[PDB]
Symmetry: D2
Subunit: 430 residues, 4 copies
Amino acid sequence: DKLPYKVADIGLAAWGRKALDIAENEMPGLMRMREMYSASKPLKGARIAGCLHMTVETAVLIETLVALGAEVRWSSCNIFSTQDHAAAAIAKAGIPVFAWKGETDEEYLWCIEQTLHFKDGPLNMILDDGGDLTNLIHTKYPQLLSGIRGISEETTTGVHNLYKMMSNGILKVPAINVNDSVTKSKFDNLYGCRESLIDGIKRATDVMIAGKVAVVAGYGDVGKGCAQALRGFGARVIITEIDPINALQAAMEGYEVTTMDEACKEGNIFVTTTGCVDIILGRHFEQMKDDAIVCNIGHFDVEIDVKWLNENAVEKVNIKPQVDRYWLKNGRRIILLAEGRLVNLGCAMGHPSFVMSNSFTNQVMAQIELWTHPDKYPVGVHFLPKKLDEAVAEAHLGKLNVKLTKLTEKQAQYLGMPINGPFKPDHYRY
Amino acid sequence: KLPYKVADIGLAAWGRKALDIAENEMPGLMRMREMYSASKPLKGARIAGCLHMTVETAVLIETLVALGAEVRWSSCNIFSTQDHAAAAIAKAGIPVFAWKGETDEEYLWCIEQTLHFKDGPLNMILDDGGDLTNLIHTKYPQLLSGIRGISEETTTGVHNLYKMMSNGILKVPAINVNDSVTKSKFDNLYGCRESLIDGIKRATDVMIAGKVAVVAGYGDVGKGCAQALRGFGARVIITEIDPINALQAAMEGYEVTTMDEACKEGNIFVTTTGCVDIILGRHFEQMKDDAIVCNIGHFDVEIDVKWLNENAVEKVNIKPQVDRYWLKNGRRIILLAEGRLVNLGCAMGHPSFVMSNSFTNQVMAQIELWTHPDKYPVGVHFLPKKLDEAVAEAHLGKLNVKLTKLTEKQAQYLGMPINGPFKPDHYRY
Amino acid sequence: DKLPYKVADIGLAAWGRKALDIAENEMPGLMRMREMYSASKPLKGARIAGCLHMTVETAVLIETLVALGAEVRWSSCNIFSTQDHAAAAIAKAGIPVFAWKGETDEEYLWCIEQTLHFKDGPLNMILDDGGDLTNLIHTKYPQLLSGIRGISEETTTGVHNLYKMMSNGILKVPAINVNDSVTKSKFDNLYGCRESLIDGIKRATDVMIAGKVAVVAGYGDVGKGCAQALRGFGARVIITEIDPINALQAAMEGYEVTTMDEACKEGNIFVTTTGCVDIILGRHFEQMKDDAIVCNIGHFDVEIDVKWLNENAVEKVNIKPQVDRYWLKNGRRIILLAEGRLVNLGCAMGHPSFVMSNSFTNQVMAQIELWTHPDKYPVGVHFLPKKLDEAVAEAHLGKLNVKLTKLTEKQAQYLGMPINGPFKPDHYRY
Amino acid sequence: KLPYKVADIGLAAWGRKALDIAENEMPGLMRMREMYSASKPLKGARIAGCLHMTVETAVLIETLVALGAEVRWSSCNIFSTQDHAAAAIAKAGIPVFAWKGETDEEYLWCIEQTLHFKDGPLNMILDDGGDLTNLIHTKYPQLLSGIRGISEETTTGVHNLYKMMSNGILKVPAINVNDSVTKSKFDNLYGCRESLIDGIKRATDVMIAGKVAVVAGYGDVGKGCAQALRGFGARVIITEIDPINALQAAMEGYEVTTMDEACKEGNIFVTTTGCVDIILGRHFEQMKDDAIVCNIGHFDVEIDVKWLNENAVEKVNIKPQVDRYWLKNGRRIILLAEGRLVNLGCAMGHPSFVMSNSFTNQVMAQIELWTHPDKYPVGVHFLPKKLDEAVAEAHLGKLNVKLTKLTEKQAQYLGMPINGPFKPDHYRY
Ligand SMILES: NC(=O)c1ccc[n+]([C@@H]2O[C@H](COP(=O)([O-])OP(=O)(O)OC[C@H]3O[C@@H](n4cnc5c(N)ncnc54)[C@H](O)[C@@H]3O)[C@@H](O)[C@H]2O)c1
Ligand SMILES: NC(=O)c1ccc[n+]([C@@H]2O[C@H](COP(=O)([O-])OP(=O)(O)OC[C@H]3O[C@@H](n4cnc5c(N)ncnc54)[C@H](O)[C@@H]3O)[C@@H](O)[C@H]2O)c1
Ligand SMILES: NC(=O)c1ccc[n+]([C@@H]2O[C@H](COP(=O)([O-])OP(=O)(O)OC[C@H]3O[C@@H](n4cnc5c(N)ncnc54)[C@H](O)[C@@H]3O)[C@@H](O)[C@H]2O)c1
Ligand SMILES: NC(=O)c1ccc[n+]([C@@H]2O[C@H](COP(=O)([O-])OP(=O)(O)OC[C@H]3O[C@@H](n4cnc5c(N)ncnc54)[C@H](O)[C@@H]3O)[C@@H](O)[C@H]2O)c1
Ligand SMILES: Nc1ncnc2c1ncn2[C@@H]1C[C@H](CO)C(=O)[C@H]1O
Ligand SMILES: Nc1ncnc2c1ncn2[C@@H]1C[C@H](CO)C(=O)[C@H]1O
Ligand SMILES: Nc1ncnc2c1ncn2[C@@H]1C[C@H](CO)C(=O)[C@H]1O
Ligand SMILES: Nc1ncnc2c1ncn2[C@@H]1C[C@H](CO)C(=O)[C@H]1O
Ligand code: NA
Ligand code: NA
Ligand code: NA
Ligand code: NA
């Protein structure tokens, strides 16, 4: 009585499959998980509802979970991030996916709702990115919580929410924080954004980066990646920050660190990375250089006051999908990307597949941990063990032709560690 | 006569919006309009243009028109046209014969459409790579005495001009635009530094970080390519024939070796040489699985694409301008744009700001040749340094640069005109 | 009956004082500690034995501890690292310092021994860098342990030893791990080495960096700094690593990662950063390019087999102090810096003062924590609270003209944090 | 006659060990020895050299001697001599008159000691900045007809040569060594990229990261300086008079503004212009406390040091070549080397490898002028590109670079001699 899937055009499946084949060959961590666990099927019995950007890389993740024995139903965690060819390939393979590029808010919620019920029963695992699925179940379907064995969560904003839920006694299911695996936060958030931020800006606007002033709000792992990208192409990068440690890191790297109240007068490009509300406001827009480009890469579209532009501009000219040029009362123009939604996935294709193999190999490990060892994980928010984190990295070395040194027994004795690791104390920051 | 031929005139409104955006990024061209729209220095000029029909080129076209020229236009590559830009130019009433994905026959037909105007044949050439110049000299020599001048955009095209002059076969005066400082040291360098990666990413979405990337040639193009790749975390290996360029690359921290060795290590290959026979069958056979191979030189002569078509066991089209070959050895090769320049073939070419440097030089060269032909005997000439400096100066305001002015005491100390030119003729910047 | 101090030449004091005045003005964190606590004198009653490189920066630290009420007696923790003008200035101010550049191993131990006994009694606090003082007291003077209120420890090797001591039940005094303050490990070890490694190499050898292959063993915080420095000047940098996560970081930054067994055939410059034994051995030396430069920046001189060179070379030619050129049986030459001791302090002046103000402001905070709040700190190894770590960074922002953004009450509510911080969870890696 | 005059002959053994090390880093010079020591092309040459008396220059001196020249030497700066290198040269029996920390009178006396050899006056000039050239022309014109040639090392010196020729006052042929590609694009750029920081660090030990650094000029020197500072985490602000250089700096991500503005923000100031009156009293009065101020241009004319001496309320010598001034406003200024070039005055100048490029050009220019005077009429000349390429090629082996060779088919395609030169005369690299 329900749709078996819902995608833009199932006819795109053959093209999606070609993109998947190429991506598989860039994702050795995921392929290794298939190779190790396809026969034993550790995820047999798992009914995973996933809510995560329905991209080519997410399709390789989905097929890994399926190869490992899971039943899966999927939606995207952003209205603009789905790659319709990837979604079509997943649907063609018989996997229930409810996702397309350019959903409305209503369609978005409907899609998540389709993932909750399997033939054998409701979901018993959650794989989430940003917390929308986690929150939906806790608030709207609390009756389903005792049936769920575990949650794994992809991103900084989502894990922040899990910590908040736990400290408020609202969290009712064990969760693993995948964002804060070393091999996720220090790779995907950093090197991922270093490539895909500029990709979104370029595909949207074709603007020259060299010669511009770029303003990056936040200097966490995402802001660090974005700043490096922009400066690499010859932009002069200004940073805003609230945290004196991150601010001091930026200044030590040669960036001017000042407030948005000042930087708004100088920036030609504005990128928000904070995960926080009220970063770019009407008072900033009114002071910006003509044709300033403004975009957000944080998870939710809460950083930029897009409502201000819609209410106060003389006119809004749509240039092409996800690219709007507003004409203000001061006669100047602002170019706004993706209506303030995360620009790398909304205007380009998100992070390339190789780095997503780090993040998603963590996801598969988390799902195996929660599903097969539920009693290691009481209701709470947990990290994967360092030995598994190290294993994720080690799985990607051969593709890059890296040769890792092995400690001799004498060196391992001297350092007081096992020759097979883990090699760092739990507080190590890399 | 056909007013134009383009893929889809319906793309005109979008094209125009992209032109509006690009105008605001092209202060040199907008300045040429503000200075010369009234006096119309190019009145009576009938310019045939053969140059990648992009948004940037559209802004150049409408600048030439504003300055009084009649213009008829074709692209200098079968894959580089941006159909929305060609539609905007067609809708404006300018004869343009260009679309993305031309056949070789269509390519020549389009150039041929640019030769004849209502009032006579062309009397000015604006060229990129020399196809229009060569076509006239070889096939339409009866039009040569009617042509006042040629201006040439690119390294490969200027090499051809110098060779023609040395052999006594050039018959029309030319200005080498490529070797204006504000072209060669900006467009070829900073332009490729952004548009090479754009082409590779739009085509393949591949991660750059952690890869080995092999860049053949370390000229102005290869310098920009190499910096771009290294910036994203590729380990870049350079090949070179010139010991000076090779020493530059080594002093910037790049491994310099031959393609014969580098083919065994690269995950990404980019040819920047302007030379034939750079990546051959013997190289393809040694490459890592799913090696991405592409060219950014003007002509598609650097990569043996014919070898792949003849020797691969499978050839799968992934999407337009992206082919995945399976070789007898079991490994795969990803070839971009059939070896044609990848930035314009798989993306949008250089962004507008830097093209404003190149194209302001083009406008100046067209004015120089059209209005001061006697300064330019048959031969190959540079624009004066004062004009080259003026191109850079016109772009400083947009970037909020504050230029220092010499005092009279400092100008006297330096033995320099206070208003420039500031460097000797041999200065390399 | 004992020397009041022992330095190379007390006559250098006036020049030392001029260097100190300049350094003070680059060390706003330490000067702020003086300004805040000079009147209340929180360290009144403290008798601090310090064992830490007797440099210009350490002199500003010492005078801060004294201004805060402490009695101090000092030695260097390396035989080659003392700056004789700094030592002379300290001695001239009436502070017992036992340190000079170029001590023998015997003199080194004698110097530490002079710091143990004060007029009023034995030491009751330890400030250490590498653990030599901590170990000396636990092994040779166990009778003094119950009189010691606390230990603060500067460096990675020293903190590793403290963790080992604690897990073996050998640690008898509470300790604070200053190395792993964010504002120490992610600044001093990284940005400090990024400047002072090249300084030591240049002053020793004047070698051109551009065009060379440089091999860096280890890609921790020190190796990251060293690699960046070398590549910035046009060296091609190869990295060795045992930890697959650090190895993957290096490869993602564009370095070749391979083993020393391979890299030894290619390197023109070799820098060891591991903190581990047996990094460069005779088998590597015999394969090195002619005039390969070999140096160590790790704390102890255990990385390079200098004994191999001394036993196997045809001859050793001293070029100048801390620079030796060995002629091997293969006819090639090796240039060895500082006899394998840490090259930044041995051949140049160590880290510049601004970054040392981060490290040493942590040291002063640790000493205040341990001395005035002993019951917060049971026998064990502890970190400073994140709020104090943030304060260290904030203290350095004004000197760099950084403008830090303040959260609004609405943003702080949204992020669920205090407007005054701390701004990050305890696991945050920066 | 005095055999030499140096600070301390006792430093000879150490000097020699430093020379031994530098020889192994200078394959171009060692190659000139291996090729020409037997044939002695410079037999009969009596070369007066005026050039920073460093370890690198010692290797140049002994190369000229190996090639048959007689040489007598002085430094071109009062603070740049390396006394151990001067001692090694003196101990070898070569007349050198140089020490670190000369007075102005001693400086001139030393140059005067180089004019007369046992067999006659000088017949060749090797100059850096033009002091020897100018001294001969103005004070010893009777020696001019006896001088076969001049070779000149540096930008400021070549500017003077061109000005002299334009005014008809140059009377001896000269080779512009600075503008060999392998000099200007290597020494001025990569040399300063390492030796500027060396000078600042040895003098002050200041942290670079987190500072604002102001670099006046973005020529080859300022480009290398700016990269060096940015690499260590300084935020670099550029000043410029030339709109081309200024646009380059902006396209590399540097703020470009005037010294009038930048003096309010910089923590470190470096002058690279070759021009008078760059940092004035009005700038000093606005600077941040403990601003470090230094010059790397040839002559000490860029910084108003006299202003500081006259207007400061206190002047404290921190150590040799380092002065801390206290101004009326309460703030301090740290001045390096009394405004003299800071890399050679406070450190060791450029490392040996890159100097091997510069100095191989010098040897070639001395051979060209001495053995082929008829190729060089009175005027200012470049070395042929084939010789410039040969300089780079001689340094490739040391760095294990593998240079590709064109095939006959590629050379024919490019219209290029298979063995070079590979670039046209106007190529800018
Ligand atoms: N689009 C993507 O592919 C992608 C990838 C990874 C993470 N993310 C998202 O990016 C966002 C940031 O992630 P992160 O890992 O960098 O988190 P982070 O905590 O490491 O960094 C955020 C930084 O913003 C700063 N900040 C907070 N409020 C600010 C304000 N008002 N002004 C200036 N700075 C302020 C904080 O001090 C912090 O350092 C999150 O929403 C995360 O979920 C997106
Ligand atoms: N795609 C674009 O947007 C764009 C932009 C500018 C120029 N171009 C084209 O790019 C090409 C290069 O232009 P350039 O300005 O860099 O020229 P260049 O002459 O500056 O550099 C080319 C380099 O290739 C080297 N080379 C020649 N043959 C080689 C071989 N067999 N192997 C290795 N190296 C070899 C040469 O020594 C030279 O240094 C030309 O075809 C030019 O027209 C393209
Ligand atoms: N000279 C200085 O100014 C200075 C400053 C700070 C720290 N240190 C010292 O530097 C050393 C390193 O400090 P750190 O903070 O970088 O520690 P770290 O733990 O962050 O890094 C050391 C790295 O070496 C790697 N390693 C260990 N054995 C290895 C081997 N056999 N081969 C290759 N890699 C190996 C580890 O995986 C690790 O990543 C320590 O001795 C520390 O005390 C010196
Ligand atoms: N210290 C060294 O080891 C060393 C090495 C090479 C050259 N030099 C000397 O360095 C100086 C610069 O050499 P170069 O090769 O870079 O010359 P250059 O001509 O390439 O660059 C100097 C730049 O200064 C700019 N300039 C001139 N006046 C200015 C002003 N008032 N304000 C701002 N910018 C101004 C010019 O536009 C030019 O771009 C010369 O004196 C040269 O002899 C020193
Ligand atoms: N190609 C991609 N496919 C799927 N997820 C991606 C992609 N690129 C980035 N991400 C997610 C986006 C998210 C913020 O919601 C993160 O933390 C990243 O892991
Ligand atoms: N966007 C663009 N529009 C038009 N021309 C472009 C663009 N980008 C690059 N070029 C040309 C390509 C050509 C080699 O044929 C050159 O030399 C560059 O100037
Ligand atoms: N100038 C300096 N004065 C004092 N200590 C310094 C200096 N530079 C670096 N350090 C210490 C050296 C040590 C390894 O023993 C560390 O961890 C750094 O904090
Ligand atoms: N080590 C060095 N030995 C000798 N000459 C040096 C050194 N470093 C730089 N130079 C000169 C300085 C000069 C400006 O006077 C130049 O143009 C550089 O070639
Ligand atoms: Na992808
Ligand atoms: Na464009
Ligand atoms: Na210091
Ligand atoms: Na030297």
